[PDB]
Structures are given as C-alpha cells and as structure tokens.
Amino acid sequence: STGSATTTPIDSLDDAYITPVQIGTPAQTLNLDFDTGSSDLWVFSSETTASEVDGQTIYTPSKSTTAKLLSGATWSISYGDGSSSSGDVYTDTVSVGGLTVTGQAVESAKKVSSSFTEDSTIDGLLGLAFSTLNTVSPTQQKTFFDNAKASLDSPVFTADLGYHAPGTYNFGFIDTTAYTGSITYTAVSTKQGFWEWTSTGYAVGSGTFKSTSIDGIADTGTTLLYLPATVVSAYWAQVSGAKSSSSVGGYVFPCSATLPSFTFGVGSARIVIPGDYIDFGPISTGSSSCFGGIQSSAGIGINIFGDVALKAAFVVFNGATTPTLGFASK
Structure with missing residues (x-):
C-alpha cells in the first residue's frame, strides 16, 4: 500500500503545515500537524475542555462506529516550545492520503495549552518520530507510520514541504x-x-x-x-x-x-x-x-x-x- 497527502502552510509565514486526516467511520476529517519530532497522534475532541476550543474541528468518538475506548490509557505531552496537552485514548480507523490503519491509537485531548487553543487551524498532531517516545500509559502505543509499515510497499515516508506553498507527505514510496x-x-x-x-x-x-x-x-x-x-x-x-x-x-x-x-x-x-x-x-x-x-x-x-x-x-x-x-x- 501507499498513501499521498497534500500538506498546506497554516499561515503566510509557514509557521506550520496541516495535512487532512480521516478518523473514524463515517470519516471525520481533521487537519493535523505531522510532526517527525514526536510520537503521539492526538486530536481536539468532544472531550476537550470547552473553553480551550476556539475554532478547531473536533473528533467525536461517539459518532464513530469503529471507535473503541482504550480502557485505562492516558497520555500527557509537553513540547519544546512549552506547549502541552493530555487526555485519554481511543482506537479507531485512521487514513492518510488513501492509506488506512485500523486500530490506531487516537489520543483524545481533555486539556490543551493556550498555544494550541489559539491556533484555530491545527486540529491536532500526528507524530512520526519513533514509537519509543509515545506518551500513552500504561501501554505505550505505536505511531501511524509504525502501524502502517508492514503494509507499505517500502517502509518509508517522505516530506516535501513547500515554501509559501503546499507540499506533500508520501507513505510507502519515493x-x-x-x-x-x-x-x-x-x-x-x-x-x-x-x-x-x-x-x-x-x-x-x-x-x-x-x-x-x-x-x-x-x-x-x-x-x-x-x-x-x-x-x-x-x-x-x-x-x-x-x-x-x-x-x-x-x-x-x-x-x-x-x-x-x-x-x-x-x-x-x-x-x-x-x-x-x-x-x-x-x-x-x-x-x-x-x-x-x-x-x-x-x-x-x-x-x-x-x-x-x-x-x-x-x-x-x-x-x-x-x-x-x-x-x-x-
């Protein structure tokens, strides 16, 4: 298998890039920040403290027929810029650019720091570092790439970011x-x-x-x-x-x-x-x-x-x- 998705700058400075991701059944499309420096796939959700949501699209697991609570699992992450988020975990079907993973850990935010709230364009993060950094406890979870790997034509993904322009993330091929x-x-x-x-x-x-x-x-x-x-x-x-x-x-x-x-x-x-x-x-x-x-x-x-x-x-x-x-x- 392969996947191919366009990634788009969030603003005129290329402060970050968002890539559409399909979560659940029927699909809920959220725009995620693909992050090769972390290993959690987390989303704004129906569980996110209401005062901390300001324009983001949320994942609602109760509306997904394929969502299952990962019972007992929690997550909590802090990033290099001082931002943070935390919550609980569902497994669900996640597709990127036509590439589908079933049973992906989707980390539902209960709390997000101000930097996330203030960025209405980013609906969550999709981590692409190594799964050893994943913060889910007590059972560490695998990244989307790690879960997809064995199904991919080649165990690779590529980042082709644009300067003041869209680019591409590809999975499984060069x-x-x-x-x-x-x-x-x-x-x-x-x-x-x-x-x-x-x-x-x-x-x-x-x-x-x-x-x-x-x-x-x-x-x-x-x-x-x-x-x-x-x-x-x-x-x-x-x-x-x-x-x-x-x-x-x-x-x-x-x-x-x-x-x-x-x-x-x-x-x-x-x-x-x-x-x-x-x-x-x-x-x-x-x-x-x-x-x-x-x-x-x-x-x-x-x-x-x-x-x-x-x-x-x-x-x-x-x-x-x-x-x-x-x-x-x-």
Whole structure:
C-alpha cells in the first residue's frame, strides 16, 4: 500500500503545515500537524475542555462506529516550545492520503495549552518520530507510520514541504519526479527516539564550506532551524544590523535586509536554504525589525533541522530495520 497527502502552510509565514486526516467511520476529517519530532497522534475532541476550543474541528468518538475506548490509557505531552496537552485514548480507523490503519491509537485531548487553543487551524498532531517516545500509559502505543509499515510497499515516508506553498507527505514510496539529482542518505540514531543525524557542515551565502559535525534532528513540527551558537553567529554576522535580542527571544534583523542563503551538508552533498526562507517577518505588526529563521539551539539541548531547513529539500524518512534519512535538492 501507499498513501499521498497534500500538506498546506497554516499561515503566510509557514509557521506550520496541516495535512487532512480521516478518523473514524463515517470519516471525520481533521487537519493535523505531522510532526517527525514526536510520537503521539492526538486530536481536539468532544472531550476537550470547552473553553480551550476556539475554532478547531473536533473528533467525536461517539459518532464513530469503529471507535473503541482504550480502557485505562492516558497520555500527557509537553513540547519544546512549552506547549502541552493530555487526555485519554481511543482506537479507531485512521487514513492518510488513501492509506488506512485500523486500530490506531487516537489520543483524545481533555486539556490543551493556550498555544494550541489559539491556533484555530491545527486540529491536532500526528507524530512520526519513533514509537519509543509515545506518551500513552500504561501501554505505550505505536505511531501511524509504525502501524502502517508492514503494509507499505517500502517502509518509508517522505516530506516535501513547500515554501509559501503546499507540499506533500508520501507513505510507502519515493516519488522520483519530486526531486532533482540524487538522494544522499545519512545514518540515523534512534537512541533518543528522534530522526537524529549528523550534518557534515555549513556555509553562509557564497562563503566557503566549513566541515564540522552537527548532530541534530529532522523535525517537521518545529518551524525554525536551531543550530549551535557559533554557527548562528557566523550567519547573522553577514547581515548588517542583525543582533540577538533577549527581549524578542532571538536574532532579529532589519526588515530592509537581503538575507544570504545557508547551506548545510549531508555527507558530501549540500542543501541550500535560500535567504528568503530565513525571513519570518516583522516581530510585531508594522515593525521594521524582522525575526530570523535561524536561531541558536543553546539551552534547547539539541540542534533542530526544522521546517526552514527541511522545506529546502525532498526528505526521505527510511524506517527500514536500520533507519536512515535521505536528502535531495528539488
């Protein structure tokens, strides 16, 4: 089997991407944030505290003939941005882009933090990291990908995120028309439950490439590119007037700037992030200070190749017995 679904930016900044997902019988379609940095499929639901729902589409398990309470199971998750959610669990039929999993754990939110409430466009998350990170207790549950894997033509999914445009998540096959050149595969460590890999270095604009190992995660659920302070300083030093602002919470730059590109290494290959991808616009409406798309990972504890990086590439998440990550230009 295979699946193919379009993923669409939630706003003009590509702050996140939503992908329609069919849950239950008859289908209830919710727009979920596919997140390769976590491993819970959770949804706004009929059980979500009413004051914490503001425009989201909810899953109502009582209206699904295939929903079953997973008796005794609860979940609770906190994300790197400080947001969180928790609730109980149902199993139900879940389909993405024509690919169906029966018996998928659908984590029904009873509570969500303010960041989720305030985002009316995101009806929940679909985690695509390794199932060892799944938070369901007392019986840990498998991700949609893990459940689908054995049925897939090939044990892979791919992320092809657009810049200010829709893109595609494919399951079970590699679309050879969706990228240019060849795919370079690189080793993955699953020890922390993430798609964790080591970039071989970076360049700033037309500058020379610096060979240096940068361990980080491929995380579709993180907006920006978070790298070591040394790397980030080297980037922003090339932008006149750029500075790190503690009041704002990171690097800002004059909105009048033309940003240089940023290149990262994958083996001997190179992925170029155009300068425009690194512009996240005014810090507040009408401001002439703009927020940067490359930020320091210092104090996160991990480097994160988020959407800013991933959208510059066609990315293969290879869930074979020895997982790997592939990157191609596009």
